[PDB]
């Protein structure tokens, strides 16, 4: 079993503006096998209402999923995505940065 680790991008659906409702996305792609654990975090704690897309895959057979939740960007609150996968020795946490 050659295994492939997930790429992770964390980003908003629309350009971020403090106080304006938006969607927070965590896109995981390029991974194999398909079992993957994805949480969205606010100030280090799990966000409760998170949906995700149905499992699909790319031309090279690697998998991808989109996890998403409604949120309102603020100056100080810290949003992030936490991903675990068999290729990882500990979960990866990727912070949301509104400039990316």
């Amino acid at each position: 079993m050659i295994q492939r680790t997930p790429k992770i991008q964390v980003y908003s659906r629309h350009p971020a503006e403090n106080g304006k409702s938006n969607f927070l996305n965590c896109y995981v792609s390029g991974f194999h096998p398909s079992d993957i654990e994805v949480d969205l975090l606010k100030n280090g704690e799990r966000i409760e209402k998170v949906e995700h897309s149905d499992l699909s895959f790319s031309k090279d057979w690697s998998f991808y999923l989109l996890y998403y939740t409604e949120f309102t960007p603020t100056e100080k609150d810290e949003y992030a995505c936490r991903v675990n996968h068999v290729t990882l020795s500990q979960p990866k946490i990727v912070k949301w940065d509104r400039d990316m």
Partner: protein, 276 residues
Amino acid sequence: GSHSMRYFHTSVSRPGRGEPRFITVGYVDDTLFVRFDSDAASPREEPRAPWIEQEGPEYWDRETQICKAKAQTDREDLRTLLRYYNQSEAGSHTLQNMYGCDVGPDGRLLRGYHQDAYDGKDYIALNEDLSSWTAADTAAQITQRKWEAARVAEQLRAYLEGECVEWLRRYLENGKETLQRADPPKTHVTHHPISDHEATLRCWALGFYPAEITLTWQRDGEDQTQDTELVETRPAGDRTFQKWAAVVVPSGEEQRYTCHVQHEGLPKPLTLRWEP
């Protein structure tokens, strides 16, 4: 332009923890329009685009029966492949299949596909002539001999030449106002110092459909491929896509840098730059 219809299927075994999970999705171009998940409450194929919801009751019954049939044969095939590959029954394994068709602007078939992977690597694929197979290893050659004896390629070829193209044409008309109207990217360039003497230029493309796009940075008209951070094209969640390309630029020479954007929705390719 040209268009595609594709059906994707994944079965994953979970020994000691139930029967394999089966998920299949269908796409027209970059738009998801149907899904089936065997772990759903009362599993049925479900619509995922407004232009397929008008299909009648016979449509969803047939699609659900076909999905359940694929789940059934995948469960047997996962057991068979353990034998072909001399593998223990304790580990989780994956079977993936994709099939479908590409059509040109005139509605004629351009290419038909039907290909399989086991544990994420090529297993067996229908060749472009729709009448021969490529087997990736000796195990897949067992399947190839079976499928040649059963004339599987002839059945797939008839579907890919007929129903695949004909139903894609139907969907393209029913969903024409979204499937046949490209959304060009909204673009801008941002500027972020990383030092007193270097800054990141990030070229943004937002809100575009379909997903195919070219985003490059040039310096004096020369591609900066090595120096560019180019993120994978990513879904916005509203059926449009996003991408950006970034370069770190020394102070004073932002003006030598241009970002070039190509997308089918643009009236003319874009040449962008950073200027306050």
